[PDB]
């Protein structure tokens, strides 16, 4: 698996600097690379894909770069509202893997964000991912798991059009990934739950990050 490296975990910076953030890549991955930003309580936000196109909407601010095995993203003029996480992603090739993250700071009320269910060990559950907008069928669906302090990690996607599924082998026993043409929904239904199982869990489409739903193990 390609494993990437994110430069610092914590970065400190102050309104007005320039910022670097690198993920280097263990094995080549062209310009397949994307940067994403991501607030306490909110879904990532797609900065930068292709590794230096920035997407529709970002502030000249963030700009990205590099090629093949070292990814650069710098914010020439930090802004408050730039104090998040930011994190790299690879896909290349499977299993999708993205960089443990970092979080740029200088050294809010949060009310279920997202909400979620308490369920308990060595029971089994089936999140849900209701999609609308936009035609269900004609894009794949990623399921990612988020836990608090540590990196993102994917679990598998799967075309809704004809089913085929991805999945990460870390998770292949765990995870089975289903979706329902009919209501536009895909599910996932994780088996045997154990602590480790407790976290956010996304489901995401290119440049659409679901809110997410914490799954409890208690
Ligand atoms: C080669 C691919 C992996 S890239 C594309 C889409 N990828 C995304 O939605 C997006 N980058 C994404 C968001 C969140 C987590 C992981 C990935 C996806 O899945 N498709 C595959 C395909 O077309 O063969």
């Known amino acids: 698996d390609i494993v990437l490296t994110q430069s610092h975990k914590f970065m400190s910076t102050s309104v007005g600097d320039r910022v670097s953030i690198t993920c280097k890549a263990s094995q080549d991955v062209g310009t397949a690379v994307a940067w994403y930003q991501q607030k306490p309580g909110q879904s990532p936000k797609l900065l930068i894909y292709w590794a230096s196109t920035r997407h529709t909407g970002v502030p000249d601010r963030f700009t990205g770069s590099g090629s093949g095995t070292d990814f650069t993203l710098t914010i020439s003029n930090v802004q408050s509202e730039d104090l998040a996480d930011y994190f790299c992603?690879?896909?290349?090739?499977?299993?999708?893997?993205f960089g443990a993250g970092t979080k740029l700071e200088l050294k809010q009320v949060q009310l279920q964000e997202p909400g979620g269910e308490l369920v308990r060990p060595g029971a089994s559950v089936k999140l849900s991912c209701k999609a609308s907008?936009?035609?269900?069928?004609?894009?794949?669906i990623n399921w990612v798991k988020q836990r608090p302090g540590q990196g993102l990690e994917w679990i598998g996607n799967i075309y809704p059009s004809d089913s085929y599924t991805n999945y990460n082998q870390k998770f292949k026993d765990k995870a089975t990934l289903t979706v329902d043409k009919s209501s536009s929904t895909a599910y996932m239904q994780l088996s045997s739950l154990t602590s480790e199982d407790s976290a956010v869990y996304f489901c995401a489409r290119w440049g659409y990050w679901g809110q997410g739903t914490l799954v409890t193990v208690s």
């Open positions: 992603q690879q896909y290349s090739s499977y299993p999708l893997t």
């Open positions: 907008g936009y035609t269900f069928t004609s894009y794949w």
